[PDB]
Design a protein around this ligand. Structure first.
Ligand SMILES: CCCCCCCCCCCCCCCCCC(=O)OC[C@H](COP(=O)([O-])OCC(O)COP(=O)([O-])OC[C@@H](COC(=O)CCCCCCCCCCCCCCCCC)OC(=O)CCCCCCCCCCCCCCCCC)OC(=O)CCCCCCCCCCCCCCCCC
Lengths: 77, 57
């Protein structure tokens, strides 16, 4: 069985393309703690502790495009 | 398309400020290394005195 369907973000994808063809600063992040792991200076980690930033940002964006807009009636998660 | 551009944009101001400060630091170091050199040369009075000794005066 193979089901062919589409996500409910097509309009949001269009808006993202329209509004983010040019650069813009980001200053408010839902989860800001992924960018500041160390609070005491002179402490450093040899492990790739900043690898999670990109996934965190993408997940926040995706889940926000879905959940927050789901309040609108008939919008589907 | 979205994330990396935004973070580069966020970076720009701090880097610009730090580079301006670095350039000012270079100029300050250039200025601080300038000193006027004063050289001392043999007083001609001794030369005149030696000339007198040659004159046998
Ligand atoms: C038998 C009947 C037919 C069906 C056959 C199927 C065969 C299946 C084989 C077996 C497969 C088994 C496994 C299946 C698993 C399915 C899982 C699934 O669906 O999960 C949901 C999940 C939902 O994903 P999503 O979140 O909705 O995002 C995916 C979207 O594509 C949007 O995501 P995105 O936006 O991130 O995507 C990137 C997007 C970036 O954005 C764009 O590029 C924008 C455009 C988006 C297009 C795609 C969206 C499609 C929207 C709906 C359809 C549009 C209208 C179609 C009209 C049809 C009319 C009949 O770029 C593209 O999409 C690149 C394509 C661009 C094409 C442009 C073509 C221009 C032509 C111009 C011609 C001009 C001619 C001029 C001549 C002049 C002469 C004078 O699906 C997927 O992840 C993809 C599943 C695909 C699996 C592979 C299937 C095999 C390939 C089949 C090809 C058939 C071609 C022939 C068809 C002929 C007509 C009938």
């Amino acid at each position: 069985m193979f089901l062919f369907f589409f996500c409910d973000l097509f309009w949001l994808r269009l808006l993202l393309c329209m509004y983010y063809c040019v650069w813009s600063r980001l200053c408010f992040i839902v989860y800001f703690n992924c960018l500041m792991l160390i609070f005491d200076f002179l402490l450093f980690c040899l492990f790739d502790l900043y690898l999670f930033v990109g996934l965190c940002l993408f997940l926040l964006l995706w889940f926000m495009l879905f959940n927050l807009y789901s309040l609108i009636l008939y919008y589907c998660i | 398309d979205i994330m990396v551009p935004s973070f580069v944009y966020n970076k720009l101001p701090v880097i610009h400020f730090l580079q301006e400060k670095r350039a000012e630091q270079k100029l300050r170091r250039v200025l601080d290394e300038t000193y006027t050199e004063w050289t001392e040369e043999l007083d001609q009075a001794h030369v005149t005195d030696a000339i007198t000794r040659s004159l046998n005066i």
